[PDB]
Enzyme design. Sequence first.
Site, short mmCIF file in Angstrom:
data_model
loop_
_atom_site.label_atom_id
_atom_site.label_comp_id
_atom_site.label_asym_id
_atom_site.label_seq_id
_atom_site.Cartn_x
_atom_site.Cartn_y
_atom_site.Cartn_z
N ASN A 170 -7.77 4.33 -2.75
CA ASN A 170 -7.35 3.09 -2.21
C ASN A 170 -6.92 2.25 -3.06
O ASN A 170 -6.79 2.44 -4.61
CB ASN A 170 -8.44 2.15 -1.47
CG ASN A 170 -7.78 1.45 -0.32
OD1 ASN A 170 -6.73 1.43 -0.31
ND2 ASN A 170 -8.65 0.63 -0.04
N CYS A 195 0.90 -1.09 0.09
CA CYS A 195 -0.08 0.19 -0.12
C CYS A 195 0.78 1.35 0.10
O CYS A 195 0.76 2.19 -0.74
CB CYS A 195 -0.96 0.04 1.38
SG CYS A 195 0.09 0.11 2.87
C1 LIG Z 1 -0.23 -1.50 3.65
C2 LIG Z 1 -1.83 -1.53 4.42
S1 LIG Z 1 -3.06 -2.66 3.98
O1 LIG Z 1 -2.49 -4.19 3.94
O2 LIG Z 1 -3.71 -2.01 3.08
C3 LIG Z 1 -4.03 -2.93 5.39
C4 LIG Z 1 -5.33 -2.95 5.27
C5 LIG Z 1 -6.25 -3.19 6.48
C6 LIG Z 1 -5.55 -3.57 7.64
C7 LIG Z 1 -4.29 -3.41 7.56
C8 LIG Z 1 -3.50 -3.12 6.53
C9 LIG Z 1 0.87 -1.79 4.51
C10 LIG Z 1 0.75 -3.25 5.15
C11 LIG Z 1 2.01 -3.63 5.92
C12 LIG Z 1 1.66 -5.14 6.60
C13 LIG Z 1 1.82 -6.33 5.65
C14 LIG Z 1 1.79 -7.61 6.33
C15 LIG Z 1 1.50 -7.56 7.28
C16 LIG Z 1 1.51 -6.65 8.36
C17 LIG Z 1 1.57 -5.48 7.87
N1 LIG Z 1 1.24 -0.87 5.41
C18 LIG Z 1 2.09 0.03 5.43
O3 LIG Z 1 3.15 -0.32 4.75
C19 LIG Z 1 2.45 0.79 6.36
C20 LIG Z 1 2.05 2.40 5.70
S2 LIG Z 1 1.79 3.72 6.89
O4 LIG Z 1 1.28 3.06 8.02
O5 LIG Z 1 1.23 4.73 6.00
C21 LIG Z 1 3.47 4.27 7.19
C22 LIG Z 1 3.66 5.12 8.27
C23 LIG Z 1 3.54 4.95 9.65
C24 LIG Z 1 3.91 3.53 10.18
N2 LIG Z 1 3.35 5.81 10.47
O6 LIG Z 1 3.23 6.66 9.54
C25 LIG Z 1 3.28 6.35 8.35
C26 LIG Z 1 2.85 7.11 7.09
N3 LIG Z 1 3.74 1.11 7.14
C27 LIG Z 1 3.96 0.04 7.81
O7 LIG Z 1 3.06 -0.81 8.47
N4 LIG Z 1 5.15 -0.34 8.24
C28 LIG Z 1 6.17 0.77 8.05
C29 LIG Z 1 7.75 0.07 7.72
O8 LIG Z 1 7.97 -0.69 8.80
C30 LIG Z 1 6.77 -1.89 9.02
C31 LIG Z 1 5.63 -1.30 9.09
#
Ligand SMILES: *[C@H](CS(=O)(=O)c1ccccc1)[C@H](CCc1ccccc1)NC(=O)[C@H](CS(=O)(=O)CC1=C(C)NO[C@H]1C)NC(=O)N1CCOCC1
Length: 217
Positions: free
Chosen positions: A184, A25
Amino acid sequence: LPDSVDWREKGCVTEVKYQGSCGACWAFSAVGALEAQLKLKTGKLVSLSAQNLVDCSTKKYGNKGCNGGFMTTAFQYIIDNKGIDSDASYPYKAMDQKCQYDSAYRAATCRKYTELPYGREDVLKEAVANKGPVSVGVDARHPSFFLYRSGVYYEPSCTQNVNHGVLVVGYGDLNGKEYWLVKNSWGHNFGEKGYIRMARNKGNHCGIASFPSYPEI
Ligand SMILES: *[C@H](CS(=O)(=O)c1ccccc1)[C@H](CCc1ccccc1)NC(=O)[C@H](CS(=O)(=O)CC1=C(C)NO[C@H]1C)NC(=O)N1CCOCC1
């Protein structure tokens, strides 16, 4: 500032993508923001390679491919790399691969990026209206978000603990309810043809204005 903005009307938003089994994402959010700036600076709209970010913007940028990442460090990689391939030349396979960047197929560059102040929805509004679509993280951990189909999304149990990277492509008002137009990356079947309107000016609802940022060519 206009009462409402919709960058799609300006032909600055590409087709909604589907991330599939890969949780990239963060990658789709970053390219989406850059695609708008590309269109604004060259008149041409082209889908940028999300796969390029997944395979090449890794550990040195704190990104974990299909396991998550940051949109801002994604921008930093594009700056260091001096380019990013087009989606056509480096297609999305929805899995981590070895970096296959080819400068011969570079479709865009990035000079810098800006990070907006935490929780300031007013500053975000200005950025969306004057600069373009902005990359943001939102709390999409609640079932109400997945089952959304229309209207303005409001989840009383949302927090500012973001986990999902999306793109704000505009804002408006619907029946008195203010909202942010969010693109999205879960395909055309999610919400409104892949889009979702989120409550705007409701105390940083779902942390949509927690960590905003956008690139500049
Ligand atoms: C995409 C999210 S998704 O799959 O669409 C989703 C939808 C519904 C519920 C939960 C998730 C990424 C999923 C990562 C993941 C994959 C597998 C298992 C667990 C997690 N999420 C991201 O990449 C996320 C983006 S963010 O939250 O915008 C990044 C920022 C943070 C954490 N705070 O400020 C931000 C802009 N980033 C992360 O999850 N991480 C960042 C890098 O280290 C690992 C965690």
